[PDB]
Design an enzyme around this catalytic site. Structure first.
Site, PDB file in Angstrom:
ATOM      1  N   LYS A   1     -10.351  -0.202  -5.327  1.00 53.47           N
ATOM      2  CA  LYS A   1      -9.190  -0.781  -4.680  1.00 53.47           C
ATOM      3  C   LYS A   1      -8.819   0.013  -3.436  1.00 53.47           C
ATOM      4  O   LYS A   1      -9.254   1.149  -3.263  1.00 53.47           O
ATOM      5  CB  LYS A   1      -8.010  -0.814  -5.642  1.00 53.47           C
TER       6      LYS A   1
ATOM      7  N   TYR B   1       5.416  18.228  21.507  1.00 52.78           N
ATOM      8  CA  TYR B   1       6.817  17.802  21.385  1.00 52.78           C
ATOM      9  C   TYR B   1       7.700  18.799  20.643  1.00 52.78           C
ATOM     10  O   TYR B   1       7.275  19.412  19.663  1.00 52.78           O
ATOM     11  CB  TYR B   1       6.906  16.465  20.655  1.00 52.78           C
TER      12      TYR B   1
HETATM   13  C1  LIG Z   1       1.794   9.328  27.929  1.00 48.25           C
HETATM   14  C2  LIG Z   1       2.745   8.454  27.143  1.00 48.25           C
HETATM   15  N1  LIG Z   1       3.705   7.656  27.778  1.00 48.25           N
HETATM   16  C3  LIG Z   1       4.571   6.864  27.128  1.00 48.25           C
HETATM   17  C4  LIG Z   1       4.544   6.809  25.810  1.00 48.25           C
HETATM   18  C5  LIG Z   1       5.553   5.898  25.138  1.00 48.25           C
HETATM   19  O1  LIG Z   1       6.556   6.685  24.493  1.00 48.25           O
HETATM   20  P1  LIG Z   1       7.746   6.083  23.641  1.00 48.25           P
HETATM   21  O2  LIG Z   1       7.139   5.316  22.561  1.00 48.25           O
HETATM   22  O3  LIG Z   1       8.522   7.215  23.143  1.00 48.25           O
HETATM   23  O4  LIG Z   1       8.518   5.244  24.549  1.00 48.25           O
HETATM   24  C6  LIG Z   1       3.604   7.585  25.075  1.00 48.25           C
HETATM   25  C7  LIG Z   1       3.526   7.477  23.589  1.00 48.25           C
HETATM   26  N2  LIG Z   1       3.699   8.829  22.956  1.00 48.25           N
HETATM   27  C8  LIG Z   1       2.946   9.193  21.833  1.00 48.25           C
HETATM   28  C9  LIG Z   1       3.440   9.828  20.721  1.00 48.25           C
HETATM   29  O5  LIG Z   1       2.438  10.531  20.147  1.00 48.25           O
HETATM   30  N3  LIG Z   1       1.284  10.352  20.877  1.00 48.25           N
HETATM   31  C10 LIG Z   1       1.556   9.553  21.879  1.00 48.25           C
HETATM   32  O6  LIG Z   1       0.642   9.099  22.779  1.00 48.25           O
HETATM   33  C11 LIG Z   1       2.697   8.422  25.781  1.00 48.25           C
HETATM   34  O7  LIG Z   1       1.813   9.187  25.123  1.00 48.25           O
HETATM   35  C1  LIG Z   2      -4.326   0.855 -13.234  1.00 44.53           C
HETATM   36  C2  LIG Z   2      -5.301   1.883 -12.709  1.00 44.53           C
HETATM   37  N1  LIG Z   2      -6.534   2.106 -13.337  1.00 44.53           N
HETATM   38  C3  LIG Z   2      -7.426   3.031 -12.940  1.00 44.53           C
HETATM   39  C4  LIG Z   2      -7.149   3.805 -11.903  1.00 44.53           C
HETATM   40  C5  LIG Z   2      -8.230   4.767 -11.447  1.00 44.53           C
HETATM   41  O1  LIG Z   2      -7.753   6.106 -11.561  1.00 44.53           O
HETATM   42  P1  LIG Z   2      -8.415   7.353 -10.861  1.00 44.53           P
HETATM   43  O2  LIG Z   2      -8.460   7.065  -9.427  1.00 44.53           O
HETATM   44  O3  LIG Z   2      -7.565   8.500 -11.171  1.00 44.53           O
HETATM   45  O4  LIG Z   2      -9.744   7.455 -11.455  1.00 44.53           O
HETATM   46  C6  LIG Z   2      -5.908   3.674 -11.219  1.00 44.53           C
HETATM   47  C7  LIG Z   2      -5.433   4.767 -10.321  1.00 44.53           C
HETATM   48  N2  LIG Z   2      -5.127   4.288  -8.935  1.00 44.53           N
HETATM   49  C8  LIG Z   2      -4.068   4.907  -8.273  1.00 44.53           C
HETATM   50  C9  LIG Z   2      -3.958   6.232  -7.930  1.00 44.53           C
HETATM   51  O5  LIG Z   2      -2.650   6.511  -7.738  1.00 44.53           O
HETATM   52  N3  LIG Z   2      -1.912   5.364  -7.953  1.00 44.53           N
HETATM   53  C10 LIG Z   2      -2.737   4.399  -8.275  1.00 44.53           C
HETATM   54  O6  LIG Z   2      -2.386   3.123  -8.589  1.00 44.53           O
HETATM   55  C11 LIG Z   2      -4.992   2.662 -11.626  1.00 44.53           C
HETATM   56  O7  LIG Z   2      -3.899   2.400 -10.892  1.00 44.53           O
END
Ligand SMILES: Cc1ncc(COP(=O)(O)O)c(CN[C@@H]2CONC2=O)c1O
Ligand SMILES: Cc1ncc(COP(=O)(O)O)c(CN[C@@H]2CONC2=O)c1O
Ligand SMILES: [Cl-]
Lengths: 380, 382
Positions: free
Chosen positions: B35, B267
């Site tokens: 899954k 940042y």
């Molecule tokens: C160079 C640059 N300009 C403008 C923006 C837009 O910024 P806001 O969403 O805040 O308006 C980003 C997105 N900044 C992110 C944040 O983390 N990595 C980035 O590239 C950016 O990297």
């Molecule tokens: C109903 C069910 N059966 C079997 C498994 C398989 O377990 P393992 O990954 O530990 O072998 C999961 C765990 N799936 C995840 C893991 O965390 N939450 C979940 O629903 C489960 O949700």
């Protein structure tokens, strides 16, 4: 969808950029639609934004911007996150403004312009203090000298000079006036060595909403385009005049009664105080629900805001309705509009000890998106 | 090969893990749980790999994940348990998929569905023995158990199995463990006496499978261990448990430059260079699956040494402090991979971000391409 899906309102989006356009009257707008538009859908939001008045479009990776042209979006577009070997030629052919921060980038692009038999539109990035990308003040003269020279050789055309703020969401931070000053001095020197930029830009969403002395010719707005305020210190989307674009909802998968003292979820990090009603929300951390939100995340179930009960699993989490009733299939609103009495991306950020940027952006693919608003062709 | 960042899945690690797990429950069948896109490893490719290696049952949480497997051409027994009113019961029944019923609303739906489908639906009854999550509470067992045996007689459904799921199996010697096992034997038995003849009885997940032989029964549901990651340090490392990690996340530096002493990085400026040094920009952030919460601790392998995320991790990238060492754009950095190869691991990141390995590998972004190795050629076509 019956389990969990994301509802994107394109009218909220369009209105936002029209609001942001007014905030910076003498500047040009750049709607940043990177990272699948922070999780709302790259192309639909790219068309809506542009329609509402966006003059430029910006993304991070070349792939992201290429995909934008692939969907027939015209107008000025720009990307800035390149790595050696990127698709420089492809970008140049589609008339996309690529950004340069080092000689290697400049050399790679110059050669690409040749093979392409065309001229690359390039913007020089100044590192004014963020210490991330861009050219350090100590190598500005050199890189500036190469641009004008590669320009003379008719291989590239310097279209702009830009930088980026580190703490612009923190009103009053000293680092802000610093970078802004360093920006002016770096621009001068370059404008003096033979560079006439099409555009001058340094501001982002928070800087835009706070400092006009930082608008210049263009402003790069991202998160605010989606009706989410960059930080609480700047206000709520409501106070900013911004309107939320995404609403995440789900249907209950089961509602049962358990005796008092019954453990719930992995590690039994929650024990029923009294015989109660336990609902089951079928959305876990794989769907984008932060597991660090365990025990705090708010969910709108049955007219009342409920809390995540115990640990949050990969596929689902439970909620204690208490005395209240509800049934399988009923609607639950994990995050949406504060004006509709529902929870918000900020509410979850706080619940998960992170920022609203992460909440929306990390909403999975397993989760379908459903569009409303804007024009019909937008929904593609 | 990808220029920014990408994930490589070692299909031979998968094939070997299941072969190891089977040898642990000699008298029980094995149901591989793929899954959530096989916990981020690629659903179809891994589903095929595990089958050919020995898995008799496949397990996914939602009907869609199950219908995708069938649509991809996979046969054999398959089962999904997460359902909501209006799900694709019909479609699921026509495609011969074992579904789980924990309430009456489900029973009546599959019954109406088996009717339209003009077919008998194989159902499995889930019993809530302590998890308090899904399944029938002990107090509604007979009611459900009754309606079921009734649906049998009508020729609509067919009860193929009785099961349950543990809450603290991954916590060695937990009181909840025995308590839950006990309810199973009692609740299961009652169902037998009242008429039900189950094809399979299961309750063991990865931890329980590896630790408790008395939780095996007919079937065993193993998810995480199949991909080489260990459920918990409190059980050992994939190495001790005799498991091989299948995922390796690599990225290419975009920039490497020198900055003066006292310069701020990223940042908020949460990291300041104690002197003049070399900084390297890794082009991958929290949108690709890197926990923002690992800001300042996340380990990366760059230029022969493990470096710690310098400052706040961003949406698309973060910086690392190379110190005195040198490197350049294009040089590869390993975020997470095999500890045996001296690389950071999913547990390493699990700790750094204050979480569990399950979430690290599972939330690896879709913007991040996957590259497959080993296994059979046709295993990586879908
Ligand atoms: C160079 C640059 N300009 C403008 C923006 C837009 O910024 P806001 O969403 O805040 O308006 C980003 C997105 N900044 C992110 C944040 O983390 N990595 C980035 O590239 C950016 O990297
Ligand atoms: C109903 C069910 N059966 C079997 C498994 C398989 O377990 P393992 O990954 O530990 O072998 C999961 C765990 N799936 C995840 C893991 O965390 N939450 C979940 O629903 C489960 O949700
Ligand atoms: Cl019911």
């Amino acid at each position: 969808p019956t389990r969990v899906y994301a509802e994107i309102d394109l009218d909220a989006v369009r209105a936002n950029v029209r609001a942001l356009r007014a905030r910076a009257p003498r500047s040009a707008l750049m709607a940043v639609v990177k990272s699948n538009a922070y999780g709302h859908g790259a192309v639909p939001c790219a068309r809506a934004a542009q329609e509402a008045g966006a003059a430029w479009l910006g993304t991070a990776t070349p792939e992201e911007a290429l995909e934008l042209r692939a969907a027939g979006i015209q107008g000025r577009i720009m990307c800035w996150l390149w790595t050696p070997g990127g698709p420089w030629r492809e970008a140049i052919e589609t008339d996309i403004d690529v950004s340069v921060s080092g000689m290697w980038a400049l050399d790679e692009v110059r050669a690409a312009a040749r093979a392409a038999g065309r001229t690359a539109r390039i913007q020089l990035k100044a590192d004014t203090g963020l210490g991330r990308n861009g050219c350090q003040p100590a190598d500005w003269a050199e890189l500036v000298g190469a641009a004008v020279a590669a320009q003379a050789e008719g291989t590239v055309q310097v279209t702009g000079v830009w930088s980026h703020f580190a703490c612009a969401d923190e009103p009053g931070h000293p680092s802000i006036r610093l970078q802004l000053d360093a920006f002016r001095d770096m621009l001068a020197y370059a404008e003096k060595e033979g560079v006439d930029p099409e555009v001058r830009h340094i501001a982002n969403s928070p800087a835009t909403l706070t400092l006009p002395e930082t608008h210049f010719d263009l402003v790069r707005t991202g998160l605010a385009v989606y009706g989410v305020s960059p930080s609480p210190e700047l206000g709520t989307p409501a106070q900013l005049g911004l309107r939320p674009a995404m609403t995440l909802r789900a249907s209950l998968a089961l509602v049962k009664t358990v005796p008092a003292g019954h453990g719930v979820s992995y590690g039994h990090h929650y024990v029923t105080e009294s015989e109660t009603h336990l609902a089951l929300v079928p959305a876990g951390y794989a769907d984008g629900i932060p597991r660090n939100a365990s025990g705090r995340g708010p969910v709108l179930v049955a007219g009342k805001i409920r809390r995540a009960a115990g640990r949050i699993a990969m596929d689902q989490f439970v909620v204690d309705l208490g005395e209240d009733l509800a049934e399988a299939g009923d609607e639950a609103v994990i995050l949406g509009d504060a004006e509709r009495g529902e929870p918000t991306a900020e509410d979850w950020a706080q619940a998960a000890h992170t920022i609203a940027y992460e909440i929306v952006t990390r909403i999975g693919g397993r989760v379908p998106r459903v569009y409303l608003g804007g024009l019909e062709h937008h929904h593609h």
